[PDB]
Amino acid sequence: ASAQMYSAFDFNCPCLPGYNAAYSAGILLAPPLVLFLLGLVMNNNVSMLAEEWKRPAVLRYMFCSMAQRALIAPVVWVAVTLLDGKCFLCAFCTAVPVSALGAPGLPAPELARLLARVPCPEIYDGDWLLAREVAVRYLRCISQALGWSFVLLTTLLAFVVRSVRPCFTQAAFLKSKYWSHYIDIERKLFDETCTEHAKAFAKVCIQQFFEAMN
Amino acid sequence: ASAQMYSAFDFNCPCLPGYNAAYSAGILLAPPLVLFLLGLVMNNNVSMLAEEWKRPAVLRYMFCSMAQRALIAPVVWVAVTLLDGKCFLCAFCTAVPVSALGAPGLPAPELARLLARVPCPEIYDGDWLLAREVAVRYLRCISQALGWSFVLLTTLLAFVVRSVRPCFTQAAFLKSKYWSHYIDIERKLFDETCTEHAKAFAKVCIQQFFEAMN
Amino acid sequence: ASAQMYSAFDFNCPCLPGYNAAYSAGILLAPPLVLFLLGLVMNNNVSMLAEEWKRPAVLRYMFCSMAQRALIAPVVWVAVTLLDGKCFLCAFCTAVPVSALGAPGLPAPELARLLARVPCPEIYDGDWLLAREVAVRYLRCISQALGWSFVLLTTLLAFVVRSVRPCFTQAAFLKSKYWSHYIDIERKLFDETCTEHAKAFAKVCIQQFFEAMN
Amino acid sequence: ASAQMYSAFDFNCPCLPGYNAAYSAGILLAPPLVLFLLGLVMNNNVSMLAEEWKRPAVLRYMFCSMAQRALIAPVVWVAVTLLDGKCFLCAFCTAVPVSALGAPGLPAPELARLLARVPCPEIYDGDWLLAREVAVRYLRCISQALGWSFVLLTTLLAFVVRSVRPCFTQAAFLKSKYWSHYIDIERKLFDETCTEHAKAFAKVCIQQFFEAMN
Amino acid sequence: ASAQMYSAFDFNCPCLPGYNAAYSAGILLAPPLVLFLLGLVMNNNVSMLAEEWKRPAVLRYMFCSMAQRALIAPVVWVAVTLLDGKCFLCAFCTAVPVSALGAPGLPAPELARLLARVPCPEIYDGDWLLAREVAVRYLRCISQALGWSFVLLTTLLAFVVRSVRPCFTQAAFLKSKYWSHYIDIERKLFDETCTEHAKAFAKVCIQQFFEAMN
Amino acid sequence: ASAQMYSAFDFNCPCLPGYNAAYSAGILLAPPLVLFLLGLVMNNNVSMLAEEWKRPAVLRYMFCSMAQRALIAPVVWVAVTLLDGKCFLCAFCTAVPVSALGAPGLPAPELARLLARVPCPEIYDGDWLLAREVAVRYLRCISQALGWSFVLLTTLLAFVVRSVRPCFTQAAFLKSKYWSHYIDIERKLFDETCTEHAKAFAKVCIQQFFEAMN
Amino acid sequence: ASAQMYSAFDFNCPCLPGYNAAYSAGILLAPPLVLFLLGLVMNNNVSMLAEEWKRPAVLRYMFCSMAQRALIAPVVWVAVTLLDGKCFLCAFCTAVPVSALGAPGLPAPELARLLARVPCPEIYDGDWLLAREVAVRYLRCISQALGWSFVLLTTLLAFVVRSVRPCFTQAAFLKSKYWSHYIDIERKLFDETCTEHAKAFAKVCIQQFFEAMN
Amino acid sequence: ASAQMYSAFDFNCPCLPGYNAAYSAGILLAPPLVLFLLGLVMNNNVSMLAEEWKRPAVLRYMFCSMAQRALIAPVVWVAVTLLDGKCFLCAFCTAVPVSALGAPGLPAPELARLLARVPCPEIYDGDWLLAREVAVRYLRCISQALGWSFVLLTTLLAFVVRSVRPCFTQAAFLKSKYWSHYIDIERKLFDETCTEHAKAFAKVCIQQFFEAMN
Ligand SMILES: CCCCCCCC/C=C\CCCCCCCC(=O)O[C@@H](COC(=O)CCCCCCCCCCCCCCC)COP(=O)([O-])OCC[N+](C)(C)C
Ligand SMILES: CCCCCCCC/C=C\CCCCCCCC(=O)O[C@@H](COC(=O)CCCCCCCCCCCCCCC)COP(=O)([O-])OCC[N+](C)(C)C
Ligand SMILES: CCCCCCCC/C=C\CCCCCCCC(=O)O[C@@H](COC(=O)CCCCCCCCCCCCCCC)COP(=O)([O-])OCC[N+](C)(C)C
Ligand SMILES: CCCCCCCC/C=C\CCCCCCCC(=O)O[C@@H](COC(=O)CCCCCCCCCCCCCCC)COP(=O)([O-])OCC[N+](C)(C)C
Ligand SMILES: CCCCCCCC/C=C\CCCCCCCC(=O)O[C@@H](COC(=O)CCCCCCCCCCCCCCC)COP(=O)([O-])OCC[N+](C)(C)C
Ligand SMILES: CCCCCCCC/C=C\CCCCCCCC(=O)O[C@@H](COC(=O)CCCCCCCCCCCCCCC)COP(=O)([O-])OCC[N+](C)(C)C
């Protein structure tokens, strides 16, 4: 439910020397933060939970669970961005070593107005000190290697929580389990009494509804 | 049920210096207002609700509920417009800084008749003071950043109503729950009596229908 | 069941100065009128309804209902025509301000024989006083804005009938409800007697059908 | 089951001055007549119906019904032909006003051998007195307007038969209803007796079929 | 099950002056004759039927039925050939009036070696006395008109057999009906006795199959 | 299950004067012979059938049946080859009458090295005595006519076996019918005894499997 | 499950005079050997079978069965390779008769460095002694003929094992049949006892699980 | 669940002489290691297993099983990389024998800056000592041969574990089987008691929920 957005969600990368960090860093942080606290609003175990959490048990449970199953969305929508390589080229294009690993120099301020124009766009000035195909696929390299290094740092970190017992014990987990299926039971518990008691005054008001004219 | 309309619904953007604000602001406000008060007409809990709401309980409920589930359509059809970037370029094209972040100047009134012609269309005059690919993807940038900032302002705002108790208490919600499944019950309550009582005069009039000729 | 016709139903727009109003206004009025009184012929509650409606109750009901559910087809097939913009350009092409918002003039009658040739077709004469891409997408603008203004005038108008009680009361609606499922009941009421009574003379004539030769 | 034939069924339009009326009028009349009396052969209530209809009741029913449900095929396969515009251009191409609404004249007989060559084909002679794109889309206009005027003349006419009582009364309709489900009942009536009586001589001849060798 | 073959079944039309009649008339007669007596071999009511039909009742039935339901395949695979127009152009290309309705003449035998080369192929000699696009779409015209005239001659002829009583009476049809479901009954009649009697010697030979080693 | 192979199974046609007969006749005989004796290996009524068929009843049955239902594969994969026309052009390309029905002559041996190069390939030498499009579509003609003549010779021949009684009588067919469903019955006959008798020693060995440690 | 791999599995054919035999013979032997002993690992009747097959009955059965049903994969993935013709051209390209059936000669070692470059690749040197289209489609011929000759040698060989009794008798086949459905029976035999006995200590440990706090 | 990632997961191959080994070896090791210890986190038999595995039976089981079924993902995502040939060309491009099997030499350091630019990219310098199509499809050869040699080394190695008894005996496997379906049984064991005991205080608190106002 994350990578599908990346198919049609376009990317812009404004080639202006100094706004790049914004639009670059803007797209890598916002969707995670919005995806995180959006799926959290979907789990129905949230509403009353913060209600009684301010008056002064299960105080350390029923919040770690939501924190886990709702924290899979951001970590995937932040890894797929790195592996593509369009979010990284847009940002650090202004800091590629020119005279080496690219020869002649140029003035300082105008150069930033030149090298900043070497993402994907077809408005790049061209020849001097750099060929566009050589600049890219070098920054795309550093992203993907830095990318895979990220997911190792997470998937390994997902091996301790599901293998160690942070808040997984019979202190409140078992007790909180007692809250599991009472509420939905209360849905079909009072509903039968509610639906039945509605039948009490049903026939009473229904008097004129039987027949008369027909 | 919102983004699907944006697939085939064309966009025009009339390159005339002064009507742009209309056609731009026209398309960003109308569909929300029409989508809002259209889904509201779909919920069957609306008809009698305004009926008795003028004679002088549940006065503060049964209207907030409809206001919520029917207010998801506009907020999505107003975010997708920003992220695309065709509604914003059409409007503020007349206020892009020319001499900087774009050099030679020109007369005032004719310039508005020139810069106003730089959306998507292929009738742009061209060279002076601006390249068309540089104008766009700078306004497309400001939209998307302003766009994501919008949805954060909403999805976070969708975290207080579903986590705080605005009109969520046992004052009328429980009482209004008693109105929940009586009406549909009344559908199949009098129907059995109605369908049965119809069988009363059925055999009476059916006398000549048994047989005679055959 | 309306917009699907607009996919393959071609459009012609004859570039002749004076027939345009016909073929333009012809296509915007006829399909509504034919769609309206066609779906009306589909509701089975129509046949006897006009029968007894001329001899001199439910006189103000059982006709407003059909008038509603069968009046959704035209209002949609008349909004989709405006939003496209091909029905409006074909008509008012002869009244676009030339010397402004388009320079040199020309004779009166021949001009109508020129400006009338600027819809979609690729037979337009060309240069003088107007560029074809500038004429269109200005009339396409006025249509869409006028279009959305239409649907607001209707969807809002669809909020009073479903929220006010024009003919929605227990004067004949409840009485007319008594006619609801008697007729279809009469279908399977006399059918069992008819199908049964057919079995009366069945065995009588079936005498020679048992066996003899075999 | 009508418009589908129009997808792959090719059209020819022989550009010969005098056969056009044949091939034009030929394709607009034949498929209706063949579609009409073809679906009539499908309704199983036809066979004996004409049998006893010549020896000298239901004499005015059981033929109007078939005449209705089998007369929907032609009226649709004759409207779709008009709206397309390829059946009309092929016919009246020889009678388009040349000197006006099209300038120099020509000899009479050769002209018919020229104007007759202006349907779709790419063998048109060209320049004089008419541009091919102007001839078509003027005759295509007159067809579609004449087309929609047709379907109004029919769909309105389909509003009197389903709203007036031509042969819809309890004179023979109810009596003819008695013939409704006897015949199919006679199918499974004698079949059980036939299938059963077959079991009579079944075991009789089956004597040598039990066992002996095995 | 007929027109589907016409999709991939290629057509050749050998442009040789004198073999055309063969390959043309060859493809219009053979598939009907093969389709006719092929579906006839599918109806299981054929095998014994010709068996006892030579020793010297139902003598005039049980053969007309097969003759009808198996004669729908050829009549459709012979109409679709005409309407296409590739079977007719291939044959009568040698008899198109040249000097009229097409000017200069030529020698007799070589002309047949020229006009015979004007089907679809792109090896036509060209200019003299005929343009290839004018020859075709004139013979394609005569086919389609002659084609529709055919299907009228058949579908009308299909209105007398299903409306008159050629061999539809209670002379052998009812008697032959007695043969309808006895045979398939005999399938599951002796099968139960056969399957049962097989169980007789089943346990007898199964003696060593119970157990011993295990 | 035959024509599907002809879709992707490529064809080569080596243009060498003297190997053509091999690769041509090679592909028309092998797949039939392999398809024939392959489907024969699929019918489970084959294994023991040849077993007891050599020791010295049903001797003339139970082999004609397999010979029929397994001989439908080759006759279809040998007709589809003719109708295509690529198997025939590849073979008899060396025997097309050149000086007539095609003018100047040439030496004998080199000519065979030329005319042999006129299948589909684009390495044909060209001009003299023959145009490539005229050679093909003449041999493709003779194949298809010879092809349809084949299938008539078979489908008609399929009308005598299914209408005459070659080995269709109550001499061994009825007796062999007694072998029909005993074997599969023997599958579920001893299986119940086998599966049951397995339960004998099941509980005996299962002693240590109940419980002890747990 | 074999030919599907051949769709996307690319082929390389390194045009180097002397490695061709390796990469050619490498791809024709390995996949068979890996497919053979891979499907063998899938049949669950293999594990214990080799276990007791070394300590010193069914010694000649239960291994021939696996050898058959798991030997269908290689024989198909080795026939499809021949019929394509890309595995054979890659190998024997260095041994095509040049001076005949292809004229001028050349030095020995360099020639091998030339003729070795005439597979599919577009780096072939060209003119002398051979045209690339003539070399291929001659080796492609010898493969396909040699290919079909292969499958005849196998499918015929598949007619003796399924028609003769190599290891098909009541010596161990019937005895080994007794091992057929005991093991899976043992799955659901001890499972019911295991699942039941688990219920023994279930209620014992479940004491504190009933209720107390709630 | 492995090869699907290889469809859209792009590949970069940065043509810089010395980073190639990193990006090459980086992509061949990381996904295996991440796929391995990711599927391991999916098997629910892992959590408590490491818990009690540190306090100082089944000590040598319940870890070999997970090690097997979760070690199929890496071995497939490491074989598909070799067979493609894009991971190997990217690495060893700097060590292809130039003067042989490719003539003139060049300086040492610049040469590495040239030969390193001969993967897929279209920035290769060109002519001297090597043609790009000859370099590739020679390294692609060595990969595929080395590739198939790999999978033989594994699939054969997968024949001993499933045919020998490493940890497959009745020492702890049978005992560990006793842990198989108790836990899920404990899910629906205490749940019925938990769901039931919830019904204890259900009616107690439900007192005010029956009726009063209605
Ligand atoms: C068509 C569909 C497309 C498919 C996509 C294909 C491509 C796929 C590519 C890659 C797939 C990678 C999968 C990753 C592993 C997922 C599991 C996981 O992580 O769960 C853990 C998450 O919670 C944590 O414990 C981690 C928290 C670490 C902090 C990270 C900061 C994030 C904020 C951003 C700031 C960054 C700033 C720094 C910027 C550098 C634990 O929760 P869980 O509930 O126990 O997990 C259950 C695991 N299970 C589900 C298997 C059992
Ligand atoms: C193929 C399909 C395409 C998919 C699209 C993919 C792209 C998706 C992109 C983005 C997705 C973004 C999702 C947003 C969050 C939705 C939820 C929500 O907001 O609900 C809230 C809405 O009601 C409110 O409380 C907000 C009201 C704020 C006022 C906004 C003005 C709007 C008028 C316009 C004037 C603007 C003028 C100013 C112009 C700047 C609360 O109601 P709820 O019932 O409690 O919500 C339940 C939430 N749940 C559903 C999860 C539980
Ligand atoms: C993918 C699919 C494609 C879809 C197509 C999309 C395009 C659609 C475009 C258009 C759709 C138009 C629909 C038309 C209305 C149909 C109903 C109707 O007409 O029934 C009537 C027909 O019988 C009559 O009463 C009319 C007879 C008039 C005579 C006409 C001459 C015809 C002969 C030719 C000579 C011409 C010579 C003159 C030449 C100028 C009455 O019968 P009914 O049984 O009561 O009808 C029930 C109606 N109901 C079904 C709703 C209840
Ligand atoms: C994707 C699918 C493609 C669809 C195709 C779309 C295109 C469709 C185009 C057209 C459709 C046309 C349909 C035709 C009508 C069919 C019905 C019929 O004819 O039955 C009759 C046939 O038997 C006869 O009575 C006729 C015999 C006349 C002799 C003809 C010679 C044929 C031999 C050749 C020598 C020629 C030599 C002369 C050369 C000039 C009677 O039998 P029935 O059992 O009572 O019929 C039941 C009718 N029902 C089925 C409705 C109830
Ligand atoms: C997408 C799918 C593609 C569809 C394809 C579309 C194209 C279709 C085109 C054409 C379809 C043609 C169908 C043909 C008829 C089939 C029936 C038949 O023949 O059965 C008979 C076959 O057995 C025989 O009796 C014939 C034996 C004659 C010997 C032929 C030599 C063959 C060896 C080669 C050497 C050649 C050397 C000489 C070279 C010149 C009898 O057996 P049956 O069991 O009683 O048959 C039941 C019939 N039924 C099934 C209807 C009841
Ligand atoms: C659309 C879908 C695409 C399809 C793809 C098509 C292409 C397919 C192409 C090829 C398919 C190849 C299949 C391989 C066989 C799989 C089975 C197997 O191996 O299981 C074994 C794995 O565990 C082991 O025993 C092997 C461990 C060896 C160490 C390898 C190092 C790996 C680390 C990397 C470092 C490398 C460093 C060195 C670099 C050179 C045993 O476990 P099992 O549970 O008993 O297996 C059951 C087998 N069964 C499943 C049949 C019963």
Author numbering:
A (entry chain H), B (entry chain B), C (entry chain A), D (entry chain C), E (entry chain D), F (entry chain E), ...: 30 to 85, 94 to 139, 144 to 255
Paper text:
Calcium homeostasis modulator 1 (CALHM1) is a voltage-dependent channel involved in neuromodulation and gustatory signaling. CALHM1 is the recently identified member of a large-pore channel that permeates ions, including Ca2+, Na+, K+, and Cl−, and small molecules, such as ATP, in a voltage-dependent manner.
To compare structures and assembly patterns of mammalian and non-mammalian CALHM1 channels, we determined the cryo-EM structure of human CALHM1, as well as that of chicken CALHM1 prepared using an identical protocol. Our single-particle cryoEM resulted in the octameric chCALHM1Δct and hCALHM1Δct structures, resolved at the overall resolutions of 3.36 and 3.76 Å, respectively. The structures revealed that the chCALHM1Δct and hCALHM1Δct protomers have a similar protein fold and octameric assembly pattern, where the C-terminal helix (CTH) and TMD4-CTH linker are the major determinants for controlling the oligomeric state. As is the case for non-mammalian CALHM1s, the most extensive inter-subunit interactions form between the TMD2 and TMD4 and between the CTHs in hCALHM1. Our hCALHM1Δct structure allows mapping of key residues for functions and human mutations, Pro86Leu and Arg154His, implicated as risks of Alzheimer’s disease. In our hCALHM1Δct structure, the cryo-EM density was resolved up to Pro85 but not Pro86. Arg154 is surrounded by residues, Arg158 and Gly139, from the neighboring subunit in the hCALHM1Δct. Additionally, Asp121, which has been reported to modulate calcium sensitivity and ion permeability, is located on TMD3 and at the inter-subunit interface with TMD4 from the neighboring subunit to contribute to the structural integrity of the oligomer. Inspection of the hCALHM1Δct and chCALHM1Δct structures reveals a hydrophobic pocket ~15 Å in length (parallel to the TMDs) and 10 Å wide, located between TMD3 and TMD4 of one subunit and TMD2 of the neighboring subunit. In both hCALHM1Δct and chCALHM1Δct, we observe phospholipid-like density nestled into this pocket, which appears to fortify the local architecture by interacting with the hydrophobic residues in the pocket.
